[PDB]
Design a protein around this ligand. Structure first.
Ligand SMILES: CNCc1ccc(Oc2cccnc2)o1
Ligand SMILES: CNCc1ccc(Oc2cccnc2)o1
Ligand SMILES: [Zn+2]
Ligand SMILES: [Zn+2]
Lengths: 368, 368
């Protein structure tokens, strides 16, 4: 098994489908990564996450470094062993959650759990991700708020590129990490084409295994997100994965794939599932709504997941209204399975040269 | 399949092991029933409950009648269909939770959920349990607090016996219920031998498929509970199941089986699991305790359950401390599996004529 091999099997327009081969397994792209917060995809055993079709999950470095701590996880054998997921894991850098004292060296912050003081830097972020043992490591960057002035977007992009080089050098200095994991860089530049180009050129000069489009899905809205992707994705190396972080709704994913994105993560299916929102091919529903109290159909009548083979809307409605844990379990399994079935439909349609038609048919029905 | 057939395969002292054959399946005795509150055994899918070895679960009539309502459950096909458990279900009468305007006709009360007004009577309790479709129906009685004066214990026992006859007649008047379900009566009389005898004689004169020992595990403590069981269980018909409601800790169960009890339910494994208490063969542990933060052993190193094959104390410690749903899921599955493994050990030891030795060995290790 190679450390990292991305192969593109088929293309349609800007969309691509293929595989990332890694030591812990193969990732089919375009890929959706369930978010596994503090060493758990909330309300699901790892075997259930896998049963939905997921090939890789995301772990949040910020949360893990506070509880249980990265050093403790390493002492216990790494994140895969600790949580019982043996396939690839991508970890974020920790930086975004710190935002949600700063200087050129990094950031110090007070924990939201107990006020304890912590530090993040390019070097410490890479070290934490080494201690966790993740397979895909994210460079540490400086997030740019939206809206941002051209000057602020430029300064933050520039710092992020300096931090990308430091991330690269820290990762390369760790023999076991450099030999077995992959490192992704993050493009910045807010909504400004010139800064996006400068950022892509700097990241390509440093060299990464994959490239994220950062700084989107932060309040700009879908039209603006799509407009920035239109010019930003073609600036990245074509032969490496393109990762859109923190996206998104099903229609966000489809349009992003149409613009050349290969990888996604988001909290929406898990978080909104626990809150009572179920995804269906006819759009989302809020299962708590009284119209479902006597509806014996499954959440979606075409979904292949185990929840839709076994339980009714009426039952799940009751569980969520009652605040029952099983309600969260069933809604989350369904929503993750829906997302994986969507990614499979995307991969198949690209492989068959009918993705543009799929995207049109999907949108027509989802928005009806 | 018969509506109800209890067969005793083996005895040792006062302890018995056997089977209850019902239309929806066989119940191995002595039996432990997980409690499935509002149409869910909290944090477990029905397939997981079954995988632990449970043959029957309990449903709480009081909670079900308030949310989602018994009429709604019947309209949706009954409780088995609604929650996805196709094996036997025992339902309580609803009366105890009303306690936790009263007259000879029954009780009216305000819902703890929204102040709506409801009514329970012998007839309405049996009707609710018919609407749910449960396989074992509990007669509606009047609970006696502990401590109780002889006069109050007598008056409450007498009312309970009048309500037992009304429960019997209501159940017999419902053709589909009488042909396919079983009806259990409840002995009362507080700690007083004469009232316990009067209660057993009245219940046997009415005739029931099984007999519960009511009014225990309400604050009297184990020694007193055991003393009352010593004289109360031999008063019940020997050839029918003896059910001890709301019991209990592992050592309560063992000593109750030594006194002739065949069936148990309790919230302890589920509720205390969600709160961080795990049962082990060396006694209970509180997984939140810092001594477990780096303990890579499973919850119990001899337990056969899936949780103990896959996850460490250290991981479960973290999940419970973090308030993660998966922590509740894993602790609950383990504790229910522990309880079922205990019942299996009890059944096997009785069947092999070595139950007294098992009980001694169990207590010596559990309390060390
Ligand atoms: C206006 N941006 C100029 C530009 C292109 C690439 C970078 O990134 C840099 C350059 C020098 C120092 N730090 C970051 O800046
Ligand atoms: C002191 N208890 C007398 C006794 C034995 C059985 C019952 O039960 C009764 C008898 C008459 C009316 N109601 C209940 O009472
Ligand atoms: Zn589904
Ligand atoms: Zn176990």
């Amino acid at each position: 098994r190679p450390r990292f091999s991305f192969s593109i099997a088929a293309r349609e327009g800007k969309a691509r489908t293929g595989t990332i081969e890694m030591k812990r397994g193969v990732i089919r792209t375009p890929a959706f990564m369930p978010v596994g917060t503090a060493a758990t995809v909330k309300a699901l055993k790892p075997e259930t996450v896998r049963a939905t079709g997921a090939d890789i999950i995301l772990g949040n470095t910020y949360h893990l470094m506070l509880r249980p701590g990265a050093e403790r996880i390493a002492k216990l054998g790494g994140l895969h062993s600790f949580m019982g997921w043996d396939r690839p894991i991508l970890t974020d850098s920790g930086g975004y959650q710190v935002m949600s004292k700063q200087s050129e060296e990094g950031v110090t912050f007070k924990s939201h759990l107990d006020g304890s003081r912590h530090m993040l830097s390019p070097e410490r972020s890479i070290e934490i991700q080494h201690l966790l043992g993740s397979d895909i490591v994210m460079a540490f960057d400086e997030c740019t708020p939206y809206p941002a002035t051209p000057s602020r977007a430029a300064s933050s992009m520039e710092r992020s590129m300096r931090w990308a080089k430091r991330s690269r050098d820290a990762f390369d200095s760790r023999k076991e990490q450099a030999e077995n994991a992959a490192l992704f860089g993050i493009q910045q530049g807010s909504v400004f084409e010139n800064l996006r180009q400068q950022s892509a050129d700097a990241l390509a000069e440093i060299g990464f295994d994959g490239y994220a489009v950062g700084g989107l899905a932060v309040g700009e809205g879908q039209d603006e997100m799509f407009r920035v992707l239109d010019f930003s994705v073609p600036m990245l190396p074509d032969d490496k994965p393109h990762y859109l972080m923190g996206v998104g709704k099903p229609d966000d994913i489809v349009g992003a794939v149409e613009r050349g994105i290969d990888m996604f993560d988001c909290v929406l299916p898990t978080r909104s599932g626990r809150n009572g929102q179920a995804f269906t091919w006819d759009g989302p529903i809020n299962i708590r709504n009284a119209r479902f109290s006597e509806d014996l159909k499954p959440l979606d009548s075409e979904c292949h997941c185990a929840v839709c083979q076994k339980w009714s809307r009426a039952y799940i409605h009751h569980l969520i209204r009652a605040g029952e844990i099983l309600g969260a379990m069933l809604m989350t399994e369904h929503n993750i399975a829906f997302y994986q079935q969507l990614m499979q439909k995307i991969r198949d349609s690209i492989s068959e040269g009918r993705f543009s038609q799929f995207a049109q048919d999907f949108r027509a029905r989802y928005f009806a």
